[PDB]
Design an enzyme around this catalytic site. Structure first.
Site, PDB file in Angstrom:
ATOM      1  N   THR A   1      19.065  40.584  63.071  1.00 48.62           N
ATOM      2  CA  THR A   1      19.143  39.135  63.187  1.00 48.62           C
ATOM      3  C   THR A   1      17.914  38.451  62.633  1.00 48.62           C
ATOM      4  O   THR A   1      16.929  39.105  62.304  1.00 48.62           O
ATOM      5  CB  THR A   1      19.301  38.698  64.632  1.00 48.62           C
ATOM      6  OG1 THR A   1      19.442  37.274  64.672  1.00 48.62           O
ATOM      7  CG2 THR A   1      18.089  39.103  65.423  1.00 48.62           C
ATOM      8  N   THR A   2      17.974  37.128  62.526  1.00 51.75           N
ATOM      9  CA  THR A   2      16.789  36.382  62.141  1.00 51.75           C
ATOM     10  C   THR A   2      16.801  35.029  62.830  1.00 51.75           C
ATOM     11  O   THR A   2      17.856  34.521  63.215  1.00 51.75           O
ATOM     12  CB  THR A   2      16.678  36.208  60.620  1.00 51.75           C
ATOM     13  OG1 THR A   2      15.416  35.613  60.305  1.00 51.75           O
ATOM     14  CG2 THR A   2      17.769  35.325  60.079  1.00 51.75           C
TER      15      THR A   2
ATOM     16  N   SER B   1      15.243  40.897  63.008  1.00 54.18           N
ATOM     17  CA  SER B   1      15.153  41.960  62.014  1.00 54.18           C
ATOM     18  C   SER B   1      14.758  41.426  60.646  1.00 54.18           C
ATOM     19  O   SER B   1      13.976  42.064  59.935  1.00 54.18           O
ATOM     20  CB  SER B   1      16.488  42.688  61.913  1.00 54.18           C
ATOM     21  OG  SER B   1      16.800  43.325  63.137  1.00 54.18           O
TER      22      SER B   1
ATOM     23  N   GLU C   1      20.932  32.653  61.998  1.00 50.18           N
ATOM     24  CA  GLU C   1      22.194  33.097  61.444  1.00 50.18           C
ATOM     25  C   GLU C   1      23.181  33.329  62.580  1.00 50.18           C
ATOM     26  O   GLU C   1      22.850  33.180  63.755  1.00 50.18           O
ATOM     27  CB  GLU C   1      21.980  34.363  60.623  1.00 50.18           C
ATOM     28  CG  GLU C   1      21.210  35.448  61.362  1.00 50.18           C
ATOM     29  CD  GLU C   1      22.106  36.346  62.175  1.00 50.18           C
ATOM     30  OE1 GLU C   1      23.306  36.377  61.873  1.00 50.18           O
ATOM     31  OE2 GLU C   1      21.627  36.981  63.130  1.00 50.18           O
TER      32      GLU C   1
END
EC number: 3.4.25.1
Lengths: 227, 203, 227, 227, 227, 227, 203, 227, 227
Positions: free
Chosen positions: B1-2, B129, B17
């Site tokens: 993820t970010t 991530s 996201e």
């Protein structure tokens, strides 16, 4: 106005509630016992009730060990709970020391238990007196444990409604080290002279122990001899 | 993820996201990682999904109880301090989460909190991530003299770079600018698609 | 001025609160039972109420085991809680020893429970008496447990409002080892002579056990024979 | 001088505090119900209050399951807490046995809960009576649970201020196995004859269940037919 | 001689202590509110005190959610503790179900809490009544929770010293589904006719919600219009 | 006959025990304070005692924070324990939110503590009133917390034996936003007009805070100016 | 990270860097590791960020409660003893932190406390990843006959050496001299930049 | 009728039980002390008892630290328990802060402990007053802690039966900063003028501390000088 | 009207309940003891009872250690529990410090235990006084611990019904450092002059210790010498 709580003394300095528990002991049937030449016995009067009673569960004498035994008088409810605590304390004593070495602190456990309830509010004491008897490392033992928790170890007593008359007899007739039979018959005469006029002594449960032996309870026909 | 969070002049912009995996195996192409935590601050998600959603529920509850007791919004230092004390009362059965809370009270802030409850002030932050990509592009292009449109364009370029160069991130970007004037406004997806097609990052 | 607390004796030395619980037992309907040649039965009077009553939940007789059973009288609330504790103690006894070996200490558990509440302030006792009955390793058993916690095992009793009249009958008519039917009819006559004039004995629930068998409850038409 | 504590009996042997809780039940509005040919219903009088009242939260009838339901009268406070405990005990029952197999021990859990508070000092009992009703593995069921904890399963009763007049009517008019409609109208006449002169019976909530079906509550216009 | 403990009924069967808590509610200032066409409002009288009061902390109306709100009267001490428990129960409710789905069981939590303290000795009840109001999945809601724990859910009430006069007005004047302004002015007239002669109605706090919207509190100059 | 327990109301519906705690507050020395243009002060009368007294530990004004402070009157024992709980709650507040954001819920914690003891039997309330004062995120604050737990925030009050006379003065003389000195002298005149005839106002402790600053206590010679 | 604490004649000087990582991945180029713990003593940070900030919050709270109960400032031996007892009541779920508390009460002190609560008096101390460098330069250049300006110049030379020769430390140095006369004064960053440009350690 | 419980105020608003504990203090022997130029002393009267007393365990003065010390009067049982709590509290204070920094909150702990027992039912307060004395970071200290928990720090007082006469003397004779000897002799004259006629002052225990030094107790012959 | 609770003083300020416990001590038999040149002894009167009594368990003197010993008077129940707590506290003392270093804090533990029960409601105190005696690191010790918890160490005392007469004798006859025999005979004369006219002093138990030695109990014939 002070005999209402377990925790208040009188201006004389008495515990009327404790003494009333001692009075509740007095309403139970007489039970006596003494030690003799190598051992101790017990005698308990029973006015024979409904023949429907299986005799197994009206025995005032109860075996707390193969080597300690006792008898009660008073509230049969508290009496039974007490003989239970006597058995359980005998077991804990026997497991932490390998054997019931001294009868005295079995009677101490029972006595401190009966003691504590004469002290705290929100609890009433036990209205029962107990007469322990047996053989230990020292020999013949015979205690009496009252509602307050007093123990005094005798070579003879009674408890119950007769107790004064029986201990009055024993206080002027008993002689130590009688051979078992003679002792029993003396105790029977003691129990006899505590009744009221007209009353005929029925068959009382009696049981004994001698040094190096276990208990036995005289059955009703061995009892029937001494009538 | 970010995640991403950018403080500018009189606003603060956050975006994530929406792709949840939960396995390797990307499983949900439309999740939710950007949450409104109060009427003037929001919270993003970059950790284990269950633990992160439980933390979002608890902080929604605690800030609403707060505002309902005192009739004042919570300071951003106060919400990060509360979140740090909560995460650090239990760290040997910890929440595997990397939180990021931003908002404006009298001056805009965006704060970062790791799994052990380390709160630290910074003007731009990111977690997840696909985090070093957006830190790279924010370090290369970011200036504190930007407007709101320039800020959200920088955010979209950042998360688009993270999508193009990372596996864990992906899916449609959602962005919410929180400012003092208009309050918490989450941009509709049509305007976000218009900004993507204007910047030319579509394929 | 002393009949207010469970924890205070009188200057005679009585527990008026416990005795009032025994009085609260006396307001419940008569229930009797006896043992005979290989087994025990129970009889319980029921003045037939609202026909709306499904008969399944007004049975004063209740099965605590396939091999122990009992009957209550008094506060129906406390009665129900007591028969529950009887069942649960039977289960704990049966699992720690593999089987219900002796009925006596099931009745002991129930009696110690009812005992304790006669002692502590802030608690009132149970206003119920219970008559347990069954078959164990020894054979036919029949106890009665009162509010104070006295247990006396009988081969016959009653409890309830009639109890004096029924035990008065049994005390002069009952003879042991009757074959089951003859026993039941004797107990029916016992229950009959406890009512008041004009009252007709309705259909009472009666159930029995024999050595090596489980319980059975005589249904209403097997009951209807002995009317 | 004895009606002050929950734990003291009278010299007659009564629990005046428990009976006063039963009196507090009597101040609540009448609610009745009966079982019939394959199922049970309930009827509850409501004197229609403030039209501001959303009818959703004044229903004396409450669904404890899709297959058990009940109605209260007395202290609305205790009533609500009781119907909560009924629901929670139904859930624990249903999860430890896969289904609500018997309604009787749901009513037992509720009754033992209401029982216990009639016993210990520092607690007052619940001033509510409850009439449970439903379908189990056996069929139609209908209990009544009073403040002391007495349960008697009926095929018809009431509770509340009318209860004597309603059970007086049912005791001389009710006949079992009526088809649902005829039963309801009999129960409506029962509810009618409990009011005082001049009072017009308003619209009462009525609901029912049949064997193999869930509950339904007759809405106000299906109720409006039987006026 | 019976209005001393929370746990004793009268021979009529009343709880005088609970009713005295209801009397302590009556010493607090009047507060009313109703629901209307898509939403509910509240009105609370405040005799304007020491101008030194920053108006923030004397608001009888309090927000328990963005979608539930309430008002108290009585012991301001207990009132405050109650509105705290209302907020905390709203939070626990909202986290175990994702949202405050029904206002009714928020009011249930508060009511069961206020219920329990009417029961146990060593506790006195809360001397406060609460009027909850809001929007849920069903729509406009408006409860009143009294010291005993009764909830009845209105579309209008009051509490406080005026409560009888206000509900007397609303009982003969109120008509449902008024557009918000007209409703408010009706409620203002209701509050007006509860004062005593000579007393001029000061500025009362009033606040409302509509379906799909949050609360707002009319500030003092929007209030000042309806004087 | 009702002013004996904290848990019983009167038939008027009053808590005489709580009111007697409020009377016990009235035996303490007068202490006042007000807020003004950017900040709040406090004034506390002290009849100067034994010169052996180190002045450090007779200060009725006490610093709960660098930004919150208060003053007591009544039982000095309960007073001290209260100011301790104020400090500890300020610390817990400041650590769970980074700073003392609102003074109001510090005073809420203290008031809920003083609240609870007006409720439960076996506890007496605190016989102290407290006047908190300080600067928060909103600005100048000044509460008063009484034995029952009422909080009303003021911009001026007193507590203690004079309180009626001082609030009577302030109610007709005080004008807001005075520059600090003029405010103090108005409060001194307020304190003056509360004494009895012949009594000379000794040196009272006075301390203040302004927006953006910490506290300071005027030392005795800065106090000595306004005599 | 790095810390430094130097006792001289009538003052004590503490300084840290400001770079928080929290990963390998240096994430925050401007943190806060130097805290005012009371009006005459301060506390530095060289451990795990969350645990260290929770310890700073607790010690701020306890010392403020202390001064508010007794109207006297806490002795430095007392604050190190309190911190040692707190860290040693829990050492099997310990705080991975290396604290350093310094200040002046009647004589200046700077104390060091490890993660197990070992308090020890010394005239110059340091903790953190870049600790042996500043111990080297303090051992080589430090004298106890310095002034405040010479002391803070020695501190800036020390932390500049640690920045030039360590990865974990870095970013802008912040320094606060605490003395009996002026109380707790934290130097503004403009004066620190002036001292750096005067010493010629800038690049 | 109100001086029976610790938790009830009078209609004047007094705590008669607390004041009776203060009366129980008055039955103990007089003990005084003052501070002077760099340090504090203490004087305690002892009517010399049974010579059988080893003087070690009748010292009313007791060392709570090498730098704090105190003296009691009242119930010697409670007194001893208090000086134990003072010692343990000094130890906890010394370990959480490295040293006994301030004597004041040692005295605060003792005071809060004695405070709490003046509040809760089922507890009676301590019938003892304590006079602490020592050297801290600030200098000479001298508190007095009474049964309610009031602390006021003096530069001189007494406690006990004489306390009024001694503080009456000191209130008109004492002058600060006397060199130790002159101070002691002034305090001896203070103790002298508190006895009754005919009584000869026996040998009282006296002990002191100076700034930078530990305690010492003047032995009986250093005491014997000032006779 | 105040001598009913342990927690209430009189308006004189006395604890009548504690004093009644002290009166209950006065009903027990006299027991004395003193220390002399290198060591301490004890003497205890025993009116010789039933010869059935085994003498081992009526010894008022009891060995709490090989180096500490004591004697009781009063409630024999509480007495026994107390000597048990003395033994257990001696053991805990001896294990946490390697040896019984000081007898004084063994007596402290016992006195704090007896202290606490004079304080809390729902507990009555111990109606026993104890006289400890032994050798420590300091030398011969001899305390007396009363019901309230006062300890005063003597070099001679009594307790019990004679205590005033014995301490009256010792207060005018006893001279210290007697060689053991002469001391004992002085104590025997002390015990003699406490009886009533006509009463003959029976055989009392007496036991002693000297510095560097353990206890020994003089057997009855070594006792018989001093008759």
């Amino acid at each position: 106005a002070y005999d209402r709580a377990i925790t208040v003394f009188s201006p004389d300095g008495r515990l009327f509630q404790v003494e009333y528990a001692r009075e509740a002991v007095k309403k139970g049937s007489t039970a006596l016992g003494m030690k003799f030449a190598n051992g101790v016995l017990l005698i308990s009067d029973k006015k024979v009730r409904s023949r429907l009673i299986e005799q197994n569960s009206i025995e005032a004498i109860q075996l707390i060990d193969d080597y300690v035994a006792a008898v009660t008088s008073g509230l049969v409810a508290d009496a039974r709970v007490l003989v239970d605590f006597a058995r359980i304390s005998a077991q804990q004593e026997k497991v932490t020391y390998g054997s019931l070495v001294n009868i005295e602190n079995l009677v101490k456990r029972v006595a401190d238990q009966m003691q504590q309830y004469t002290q705290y509010g929100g609890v009433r004491p036990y209205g029962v007196s107990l007469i322990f008897a047996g053989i230990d490392q020292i020999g013949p033992r015979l205690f009496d444990c009252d509602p307050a928790g007093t123990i005094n170890e005798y070579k003879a007593t009674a408890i119950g409604s007769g107790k004064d008359a029986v201990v009055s007899f024993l206080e002027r007739e008993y002689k130590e080290n009688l051979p078992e039979k003679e002792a029993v018959t003396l105790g029977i005469k003691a129990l006899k002279s505590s009744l009221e006029e007209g009353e005929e002594l029925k068959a009382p449960e009696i049981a004994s122990i001698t040094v190096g032996n276990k208990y036995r309870i005289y059955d009703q026909e061995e009892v029937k001899k001494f009538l | 993820t970010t995640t991403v969070g950018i403080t500018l002049k009189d606003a603060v912009i956050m975006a994530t996201e929406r792709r949840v995996t939960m396995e390797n195996f990307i499983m949900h192409k439309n999740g939710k990682k950007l949450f409104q935590i109060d009427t003037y601050t929001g919270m993003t998600i970059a950790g284990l999904v269950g633990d992160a959603q439980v933390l979002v529920r608890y902080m929604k509850a605690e800030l609403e109880l707060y505002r309902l007791q005192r009739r004042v919004n919570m300071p951003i230092e106060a919400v990060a301090t509360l979140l740090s004390n909560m995460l650090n009362q239990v760290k040997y059965m910890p929440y595997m989460v990397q939180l990021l809370v931003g908002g404006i009270d009298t001056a805009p802030h965006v704060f970062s909190i790791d799994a052990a409850g380390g709160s630290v002030e910074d003007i731009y932050a990111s977690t997840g991530s696909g985090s070093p990509f957006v830190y790279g592009v924010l370090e290369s292009q970011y200036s504190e003299k930007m407007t709101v449109d320039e800020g959200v364009d920088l955010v979209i370029r950042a998360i688009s770079a993270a999508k193009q160069r990372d596996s864990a991130s992906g899916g449609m970007i959602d962005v919410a600018v929180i400012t003092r004037k208009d309050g918490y406004v989450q941009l509709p997806t049509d305007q976000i698609e218009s900004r993507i097609r204007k910047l030319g990052l579509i394929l």
